[PDB]
Design a protein that fits this description.
Layout lengths: L7 H17 L9 H6 L4 E4 L15 H9 L5 E4 L19
Antiparallel strand pairs: 1-2
Helix pairs in contact: 1-3
Length: 99
């Protein structure tokens, strides 16, 4: 997590990445497996989200939606009922691959 992040989408992306990590108990940022959360929304999900606002990628969230989330991004929470689903994180990678 570095200071900057320009663009809601980006910011939001990071926001979650971070939060998501927190629950995971990591120092560095990671990619939120929206899939795992989709195939296991009862296990893997988020808390402290905005009303009338689900939990999806930032590339989906509206322009105003993002911010709204960012506003409550300080109250957001990530529950890892089953982290195993993620099955570790590291996998021979150093740097932003693809994006």
């Amino acid at each position: 997590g570095s200071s900057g992040s320009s663009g809601l989408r980006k910011m939001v992306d990071q926001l979650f990445c971070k939060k998501f990590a927190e629950a995971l108990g990591s120092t560095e940022a990671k990619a939120v497996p929206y899939q795992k959360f989709e195939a296991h929304p009862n296990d893997l999900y988020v808390e402290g989200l905005p009303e009338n606002i689900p939990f999806r990628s930032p590339s989906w969230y509206g322009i105003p939606r993002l911010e709204k989330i960012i506003q409550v991004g300080n109250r957001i929470k990530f529950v890892i009922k089953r982290p195993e689903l993620l099955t570790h994180s590291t996998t021979e990678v150093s740097g932003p691959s693809s994006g």
